[PDB]
Design a protein around this ligand. Structure first.
Ligand code: CLA
Ligand code: CLA
Ligand code: CLA
Ligand code: CLA
Ligand code: CLA
Ligand code: CLA
Ligand code: PL9
Ligand code: BCR
Ligand code: BCR
Ligand code: BCR
Ligand code: BCR
Ligand code: CL
Ligand code: FE
Ligand code: MN
Lengths: 37, 62, 28, 35, 38, 448, 335, 77, 340
């Protein structure tokens, strides 16, 4: 699957693809924190 | 070599994490940002170094 | 040995950046 | 049935040409404001 | 708004509390159903 | 600036960047990082689950096949012999993403918010026509260089996976691409309707690499052209020069490209192979038919003059022209050309004699494997239509790509409608509503 | 004097015409006129059409003994496929009609014209110095018309699997569609019906709330509608009364008080809904099907217990077995 | 009156963090001890059939409906 | 005395109003909702049809229902204290007592809301058009959930509260009555799509003829709730629409009344349609077509395809959809397309 040395980071690799959607959520977090200008 | 390879790769993931929380508040905050210009420079220099020394060490392990 | 340690950390990584800029008041 | 192909092509072509020449002809100042 | 001569529990009180205790009791039961083997 | 002194609510916030160049630059060079990040992250995620002796289309890989088409990590017949190119492509994209994002956060928060007072070559104005044509010229040149990279891969660096090669596909090097404009522009004169087909009708990699040379150099010449030229009068009277008009045209372009892409990925099998993505739409029907014929022929039945329970053939039929094609409801597909089905096709459709004696093993097993794997599935990924039971799970990669790019294209069309309307209305100046005192209709003759 | 082009070009863009006719119009009008002629003639006096390419014609013409409900223009043949099939690619008009010729002839012109109509709406709004994006709202029925007449044929691979141009034929289309893909368990079709039911609902309650707040300029022998005298500078009801009515009905926070928000929302709900179901048909053309649950309840003996989804699957199997005359043997199909 | 006034007062927490876990646990224990199966009389997934009655139970009279279903439950189906 | 006290404590202004209608509305509505929520959660339908329809049995949210009573109950209401459960709660749950419970209590909750609308309108001092408009869903409710099972032999053929159980109703109606070919349903569908058509277009026209009164591109902030000056150019809307389509409103009062009129009438005409099916009077055939398809076997129309399909729906759904008949059909008498 992944070379045997990096195999330890098999969970780290599984959590990579959902990092993009979070940016769009963070932008709403940001906006509510400054109280919506 | 493989313990050293894991050790270097673990520090890279950690130092990327420390970098990804560190530089936005380094540029952004207004009550110190200009003193953090050397910290982010040395930090990013070490980052690209650490990346490439782990990279060449791949072929010497696997 | 836990590798769930970074999946813990990586979800709070975002708002901690904003939380501190809201402690250090400026440029949110 | 062969004449039919040619006269349909000519008709279609005539209309598409009026269309393009019509949109080249000064359309962004046809508005009632800022003409 | 709900009255200003203030009965001890008003009308808003029963409205939120007929919809508070069943759904807490229900999402505790529905969650338990998930761990039934089937 | 950054409150309601700008003329946009928070849900239109990105529109405060029409007049700030640096802040806008930071926004885009930061977003590029996301596109690259997903490329790398997704192929690493796919590879962590990849079984490299199981065909790619039955496990959901949709980024490894693009690399496989370039003939990296593959042997003959589309098997994996080593998995290193996958890892290196993914990890180097994921690493370069950081470099893009770094430039993002810097130009957005630390950089000058106006680049016209800073620089006069990164200083630009949407109403300055000359700057736009020069930037457009740069961008055409880096696209021209980008188009010649594939030609390099084709001729020097081990070529491409040719699926039309003898005995199933094999990686083959192009040693002679067409440089013949007649054949090249001939594709653009064909009718889009079934039977013929537009540029989608490509059937060999010589035309592909040849056309890549052709489009590359017309855009290097055109890119050089827009640095050394100022737009003409009729060109200036045909347009609205506004920072939003360019976006409208570009949305129009992207919606057209998505419609074309979803047509490609559904029908072609030269640039989207049959050994890295599953069979195509007609390919499974034709396969079912072909393996049925082969099975029933071994019992010694007459299949060559066999008439149905409605007549007009039982295994084979006549097309309109008179070629021997497949019968039943496989009579709407005979525009299908497969690599595996073509050695059996006579001078006017299939020749039943070639069927009896010139069956090679890989052909009949290709036909048999493609029969039970036809583009269907549900939105919770289990094979078949709504009558059959959940016991086999199939969703062609073709359907995922087709459905996604279709709905994104429809939405990019309606976005082009929106931004064209805003740009046109804002130009003339009634995009904030209709001025009270004077109104057009109050000065126009009343219909009766 | 001025030459004929300048005269023509301001005759076209004349916004003093009784009916507008743009540059989109000059290409809209012939295509739709032709569409109208071919529909009126073909619904009435067409010969029967071989649609299954095995010599069973279907009558859809009134003159060969149909009424309005059963009549239709019968789709192009399965033998013709996705081919372009005009009058001059046939050997005779006789056999062009035999292969469902007029069906293609109505729909190409009609879809083209319906897009040119979308263009014309924008042009008239641009000439009247009013806001755009009535044309953005028109993209919803238009995209559903495309999906049903052009995309779903490309996807299934023939124009026989189009929707006939008629009422009972439309019903036939729905019933075969449900059997072969089960559209009711597709979440997108569920948002489409929600948008239509909610759209109809918001129309009714909007109508009642505004007509119940009207001012008194009338008497009780002349209709209420003569309170508006055309193009009043006085809005003809009191928003805070309706707001105060709605605000006691559900609550104070469940009642809009900005007519501009109310009307934006009134326009936004069904349009998003109709997009979603139009796309739903379009993805089913590539054969991304609704959710299918076979046996969600099984016990310890390992024997199944039915669900309502199973009763629906039995019906689907019934319809689908009837829509297959092509043989008894069909193992993994479509298409 | 706004939720802001409700989300802060100590008496709100001193009731709630005490009542709600009891209700959560009352709801959990209600299904997990199998009591929901007896008070609603819903079968367990080993009691839909029996080894002498391999067809669906069906009521066919409306005044002995009660007795008919009690017969099916008495024979351990 | 005490009456006018009970009056002004009820009719008082509060975050949410109660009134005399509150006394009928709130218990009935709350019990009906609550019943459905416990029925979808714990209650089986295995002693009635041979289905599972609850989370306790393992079904998801797309396949649960509070299912109808059994066929042998007739049209009995099945009261808890009555001589079909005799003071017993468990059997009452098994026999489908919750369906009727929910149906009756929801039927009174509808009357409560209807009355509530009248009362609030009489109080605020506006005309009661919203309550007249709200009689269309009650017409539909009592025509589909009450009159239709009372015309048949039981509650068993009524729709069960649940999404998939309503889908099965759609297929049942199509299969046995050919419901789309009845003109009252044509009129209802038209009325409802026309309501939906008017919604999108009216919103789009008002929102795209707004005056300039703001400073930002968004015009949502240029509105004050007062009616002193007009908020959209009606004249412009008329001039636009009379030119692109040919006819236009030139009377607001009439436009809003047309908006009220189209879907409420649609639903009323459809209610007449489903009470027509309750006697099994159903538009299903045109006799001229049968005699013609009898004398000529190579005649085909789409209508004949629809009747063959109706055969398929019925013959294949009947076994598990009418278990109380204990139907058994051999595998050789089921209808088949390929046998034609
Ligand atoms: C692709 C390029 C592109 C670009 C660069 C722009 C740029 C812009 N648009 Mg445009 N637009 C586009 C495409 C594009 N658009 C398309 C394709 C459509 C059709 C929908 C539109 C429709 C549109 C409208 C209607 C409007 C704009 C407006 C704007 C401006 C402000 C936008 C803003 O702040 O939103 C900030 C964005 C949000 C608050 C949206 C957040 C969405 C969330 C919460 C959920 C997203 C879910 C996702 C779609 C589904 C998948 C999720 C996944 C996780 C599985 C800005 C200049 C505005 C303007 O001023 O126009 C002139 C305005 O009114 N745009
Ligand atoms: C990919 C999406 C995208 C991008 C690239 C941007 C970019 C930007 N937006 Mg937009 N926006 C977006 C989505 C996005 N936005 C969406 C979806 C919405 C809807 C809510 C908005 C709503 C919105 C509004 C209302 C406004 C903007 C504004 C801006 C600018 C803010 C600059 C600033 O001072 O930030 C300050 C912010 C911070 C200090 C906190 C965020 C921290 C950042 C920069 C990093 C986070 C990611 C990560 C951890 C960094 C790793 C670095 C590593 C590689 C080393 C900036 C150029 C503003 C604007 O136009 O002003 C002129 C403004 O008022 N945006
Ligand atoms: C692609 C988008 C893009 C654009 C348009 C810019 C534009 C700019 N950047 Mg940025 N930058 C980017 C991406 C981008 N950057 C990325 C990805 C990063 C992370 C590496 C950075 C990080 C960065 C920083 C931190 C700084 C700049 C600076 C500059 C400014 C330079 C002014 C000058 O006189 O330069 C004169 C220099 C040149 C004309 C030559 C540059 C040669 C280099 C550095 C790159 C060459 C790359 C490649 C090999 C080119 C191949 C071309 C090929 C066709 C043969 C300019 C406005 C500086 C500035 O003042 O910004 C305001 C500053 O502080 N850049
Ligand atoms: C002086 C010339 C010049 C040159 C050469 C470029 C070059 C580029 N610009 Mg550009 N730009 C210029 C001036 C210039 N800029 C000016 C005056 C402005 C106005 C401020 C901008 C504003 C601008 C913006 C805002 C953007 C660009 C983008 C781009 C990139 C397009 C990538 C692409 O097409 O992806 C497809 C890829 C290819 C065709 C393959 C490229 C192969 C070659 C030729 C380069 C590869 C090596 C190089 C170091 C880049 C590596 C990228 C990495 C992520 C892998 C490219 C690096 C965009 C971008 O991607 O930035 C992130 C973007 O958003 N430009
Ligand atoms: C792809 C990106 C791109 C973009 C955005 C532009 C943008 C522009 N170019 Mg340009 N150009 C490009 C690439 C690009 N160019 C390349 C790569 C070449 C080299 C081959 C050229 C060669 C070129 C020339 C020769 C000229 C421009 C000009 C212009 C301006 C045209 C003004 C106008 O109204 O034309 C509108 C044009 C038309 C309406 C006629 C179109 C005729 C054709 C191509 C199609 C007719 C429609 C037909 C039905 C389509 C059938 C397709 C079929 C296959 C189905 C505009 C600023 C002009 C200018 O002022 O430059 C300064 C000018 O003289 N361009
Ligand atoms: C105001 C709200 C209200 C209304 C209208 C009803 C209405 C109804 N309930 Mg319900 N119920 C309610 C509140 C309400 N209930 C509450 C709060 C509870 C919880 C305690 C229940 C619990 C309940 C259960 C469990 C059930 C019903 C059932 C029923 C129905 C059966 C008939 C019945 O009991 O009528 C209600 C009223 C009466 C029977 C009698 C009223 C008598 C009055 C007005 C005067 C009597 C005068 C005098 C003493 C007569 C003397 C005669 C003598 C001289 C011979 C009916 C639709 C059943 C059902 O739906 O089955 C399908 C059922 O299962 N009820
Ligand atoms: C050979 C041939 C051609 C044969 C014919 C084939 C064929 C099928 C014929 C059709 C016959 C057929 C079978 C009919 C069946 C159904 C039928 C009889 C239905 C009528 C009965 C009915 C349902 C009654 C009750 C419900 C009802 C009234 C429904 C009507 C629905 C309907 C279509 C409404 C109209 C919608 C519509 C398009 C409105 C546009 C209004 C408009 C001009 C708005 C613009 C506008 C908006 C503004 O906001 C403002 C401000 C202004 C100013 C303004 O202007
Ligand atoms: C270092 C590193 C890395 C990376 C990291 C990162 C990048 C992280 C992330 C970060 C981020 C990027 C994060 C984010 C976050 C976010 C979230 C998680 C979300 C949030 C939101 C929410 C949850 C919501 C909210 C709300 C509500 C609730 C209500 C309304 C309002 C609002 C919407 C606001 C990797 C992995 C490559 C590996 C190597 C190293
Ligand atoms: C502006 C803004 C924004 C946005 C932003 C963005 C868009 C950004 C992005 C950026 C980016 C785009 C980033 C990224 C990052 C990344 C990184 C930093 C990475 C790292 C990695 C590494 C280091 C690696 C490692 C490894 C290896 C090497 C191998 C194996 C695996 C692993 C993973 C372990 C928002 C809206 C939010 C807010 C407002 C403002
Ligand atoms: C062979 C081949 C190839 C290539 C090809 C080529 C060579 C292409 C070309 C392309 C092209 C060649 C394209 C074109 C396009 C075009 C367009 C898209 C259009 C334009 C125009 C317009 C858009 C216009 C507009 C207008 C009008 C019309 C009117 C007047 C006004 C205006 C301006 C508005 C490839 C690679 C695939 C490979 C394989 C094969
Ligand atoms: C039967 C009966 C009765 C009654 C009872 C009752 C009244 C009950 C109630 C109950 C209840 C009252 C319940 C409730 C529950 C609840 C629930 C079931 C909920 C759910 C929720 C959810 C699921 C959520 C979701 C969401 C949302 C909403 C938003 C967004 C986010 C989310 C998605 C998360 C009586 C005793 C009289 C008699 C006997 C019989
Ligand atoms: Cl059929
Ligand atoms: Fe209105
Ligand atoms: Mn079909």
């Amino acid at each position: 699957k992944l070379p045997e040395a990096y195999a330890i980071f098999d969970p780290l690799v599984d959590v990579l693809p959902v990092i993009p959607v979070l940016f769009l959520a963070l932008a709403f977090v940001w906006q509510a924190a400054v109280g919506f200008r | 070599m493989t313990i050293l390879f894991q050790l270097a790769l673990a520090a890279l993931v950690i130092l990327s994490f420390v970098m990804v929380i560190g530089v936005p508040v380094a540029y952004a905050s207004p009550q110190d940002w200009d003193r953090s210009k050397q910290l982010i420079f040395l930090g990013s220099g070490l980052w690209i170094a650490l990346v490439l020394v782990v990279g060449v060490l791949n072929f010497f392990v696997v | 040995i836990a590798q769930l340690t970074m999946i813990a950390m990586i979800g709070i990584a975002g708002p901690m950046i904003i939380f501190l800029l809201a402690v250090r008041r400026g440029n949110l | 049935m062969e004449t039919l192909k040619i006269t349909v092509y000519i008709v279609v072509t005539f209309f598409v040409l009026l269309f393009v020449f019509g949109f080249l002809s000064g359309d962004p100042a046809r508005n009632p404001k800022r003409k | 708004q709900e009255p200003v001569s203030y009965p001890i529990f008003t009308v808003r009180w029963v409205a939120v509390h007929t919809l508070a205790v069943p759904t807490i009791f229900f999402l505790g039961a529905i969650a338990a159903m998930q761990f039934i083997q089937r | 600036r950054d409150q309601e002194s700008s003329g946009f609510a928070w849900w239109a916030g990105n529109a405060r960047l029409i007049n700030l160049s640096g802040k806008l630059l930071g926004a885009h060079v930061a977003h590029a990082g996301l596109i690259v990040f997903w490329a790398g992250a997704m192929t690493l995620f796919e590879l962590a689950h990849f079984i490299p002796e199981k065909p790619m289309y039955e496990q959901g890989l949709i980024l490894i096949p693009h690399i496989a088409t370039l003939g990296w990590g593959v042997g003959p017949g589309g098997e994996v012999v080593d998995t290193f190119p996958f890892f290196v492509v993914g990890v180097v994209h994921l690493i370069s993403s950081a470099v893009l994002g770094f430039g993002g956060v810097y130009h957005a928060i630390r950089g000058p918010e106006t680049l016209e007072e800073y620089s006069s070559f990164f200083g630009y104005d949407w109403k300055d026509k000359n700057k736009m044509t020069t930037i457009l010229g740069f961008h055409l040149i880096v696209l021209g260089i980008g188009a010649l990279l594939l030609v390099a891969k084709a001729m020097f660096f081990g070529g491409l996976y040719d699926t039309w090669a003898p005995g199933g596909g094999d990686v083959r090097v192009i040693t002679n691409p067409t440089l013949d404009p007649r054949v090249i522009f001939g594709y653009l004169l064909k009718s889009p309707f079934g039977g013929e087909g537009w540029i989608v009708s490509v059937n060999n990699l010589e035309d592909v690499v040849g056309g890549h040379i052709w489009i590359g150099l017309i855009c290097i010449a055109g890119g050089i052209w827009h640095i050394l030229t100022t737009p003409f009068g009729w060109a200036r009277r045909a347009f609205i020069w506004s920072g939003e008009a360019y976006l409208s045209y570009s949305l129009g372009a992207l919606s057209m490209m998505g419609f074309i892409a979803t047509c490609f990925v559904w029908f072609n099998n030269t640039v989207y192979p049959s050994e890295f993505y599953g069979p195509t739409g007609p390919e499974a029907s034709q396969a079912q038919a072909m393996t049925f014929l082969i099975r029933d022929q071994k019992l010694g039945a007459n299949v060559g003059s066999a008439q149905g329970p409605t007549g007009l053939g039982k295994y084979l039929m006549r097309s309109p022209t008179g070629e021997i094609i497949f019968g039943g409801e496989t009579m709407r597909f005979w525009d299908f050309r497969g690599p595996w089905l073509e050695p059996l096709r006579g001078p006017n459709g299939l020749d039943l004699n070639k069927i009896k004696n010139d069956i090679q093993p890989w052909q009949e097993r290709r036909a048999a494997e493609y029969m039970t794997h036809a583009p269907l599935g549900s939105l919770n990924s289990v094979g078949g239509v709504a009558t059959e039971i959940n016991s086999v799970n199939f969703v062609s990669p073709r359907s995922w790509l087709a459905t996604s790019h279709f709905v994104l294209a429809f939405f990019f069309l309606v976005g082009h409608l929106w931004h064209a309307g805003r740009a046109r209305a804002a130009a003339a100046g009634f995009e904030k509503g209709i001025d009270r005192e004077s109104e057009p209709v109050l000065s126009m003759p009343s219909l009766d | 004097s001025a030459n004929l082009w300048e005269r023509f070009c301001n005759w076209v863009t004349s916004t003093d015409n009784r009916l507008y006719v743009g540059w989109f119009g000059v290409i809209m009008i012939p295509t739709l006129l032709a569409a109208t002629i071919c529909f009126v003639i073909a619904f009435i006096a067409a010969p029967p059409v071989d649609i299954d390419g095995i010599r069973e014609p279907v009558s859809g013409s009134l003159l060969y003994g149909n009424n309005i409900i059963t009549g239709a223009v019968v789709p192009s043949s399965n033998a013709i496929g996705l081919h372009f099939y005009p009058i001059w690619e046939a050997a005779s008009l006789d056999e062009w009609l035999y292969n469902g010729g007029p069906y293609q002839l109505i729909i190409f012109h009609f879809l083209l014209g319906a897009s040119c109509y979308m263009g014309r709406q924008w042009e008239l709004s641009y000439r009247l110095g009013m806001r755009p994006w009535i044309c953005v709202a028109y993209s919803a029925p238009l995209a559903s018309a495309f999906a049903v007449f052009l995309i779903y044929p490309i996807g299934q691979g023939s124009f026989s699997d189009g929707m006939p141009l008629g009422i009972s034929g439309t019903f036939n289309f729905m019933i075969v569609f449900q059997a072969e893909h089960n559209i009711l368990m597709h979440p997108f079709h569920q948002l489409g019906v929600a948008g239509v039911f909610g759209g109809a609902l918001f129309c009714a309650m909007h109508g009642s709330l505004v007509t119940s707040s009207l001012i008194r300029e009338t008497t009780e022998t002349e209709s209420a509608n003569y309170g508006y005298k055309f193009g009043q500078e006085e809005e003809t009801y009191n928003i805070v009364a309706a707001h105060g009515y709605f605000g006691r009905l559900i609550f104070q926070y469940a009642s809009f008080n900005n007519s501009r928000s109310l009307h934006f929302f009134l326009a936004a709900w069904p349009v998003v809904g109709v997009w979603f179901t139009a796309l739903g048909i379009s993805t089913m053309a590539f054969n991304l099907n609704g959710f299918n649950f076979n046996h969600s309840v099984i016990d310890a003996k390992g024997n199944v217990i039915n669900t309502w989804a199973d009763i629906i699957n039995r019906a689907n199997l019934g319809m689908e077995v009837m829509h297959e005359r092509n043989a008894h043997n069909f193992p993994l199909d479509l298409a | 009156r706004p939720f802001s006034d409700i989300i802060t007062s100590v008496r709100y927490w001193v009731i709630h963090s005490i009542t709600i876990p009891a209700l959560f646990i009352a709801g959990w224990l209600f299904v997990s001890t199998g009591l929901a199966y007896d008070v609603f009389g819903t079968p367990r997934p080993d009691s839909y059939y029996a080894q002498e009655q391999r067809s669906i139970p069906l009521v066919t009279d409306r005044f002995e409906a009660k007795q008919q279903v009690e017969t099916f439950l008495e024979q351990l189906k | 005395g005490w009456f006018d006290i009970l009056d002004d404590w009820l009719k008082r202004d509060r975050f949410v109003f109660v009134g005399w209608s509150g006394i009928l509305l709130f218990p009935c509505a709350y019990l009906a909702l609550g019943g459905w929520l416990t029925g979808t959660t714990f209650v089986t339908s295995w002693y009635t049809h041979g289905l599972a329809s609850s989370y306790l049995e393992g079904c998801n949210f797309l396949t649960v229902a509070v299912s109808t009573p059994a066929n042998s109950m007739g049209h009995s209401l099945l009261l808890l204290w009555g001589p079909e459960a005799q003071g017993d709660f468990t059997r009452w749950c098994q026999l489908g007592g919750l369906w009727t419970f929910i149906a009756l209590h929801g039927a009174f909750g509808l009357i409560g809301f209807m009355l509530r609308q009248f009362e609030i309108a009489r109080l605020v001092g506006v005309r009661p058009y919203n309550a007249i408009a709200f009689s269309a869903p009650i017409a539909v409710f009592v025509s589909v959930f009450l009159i239709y099972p009372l015309g048949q032999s039981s509650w068993f053929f009524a729709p069960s509260f649940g999404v998939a159980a309503i889908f099965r109703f759609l297929l049942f109606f199509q299969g046995f009555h050919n419901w789309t070919l009845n003109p009252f349903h044509m009129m209802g569908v038209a009325g409802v799509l026309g309501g939906a058509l008017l919604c999108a277009i009216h919103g789009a026209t008002v929102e795209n003829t707004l005056f300039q009164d703001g400073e930002g591109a968004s015009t949502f902030r240029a509105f004050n709730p007062t009616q002193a000056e007009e908020t959209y150019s009606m004249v412009t809307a008329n001039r636009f629409w009379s030119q692109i389509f040919g006819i236009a409103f030139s009377n607001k009062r009439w436009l809003h009344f047309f908006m009220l009129f189209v879907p409420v009438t649609g639903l009323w005409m459809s209610a007449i349609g489903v009470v027509g099916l309750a006697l099994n009077l159903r538009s299903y055939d045109f006799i001229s077509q049968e005699i013609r398809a009898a004398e000529d076997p190579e005649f085909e129309t789409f209508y004949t395809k629809n009747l063959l399909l109706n055969e398929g729906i019925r013959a294949w759904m009947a076994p598990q959809d009418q278990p109380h008949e204990n139907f058994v059909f051999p595998e050789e008498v089921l209808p088949r397309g390929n046998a034609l």
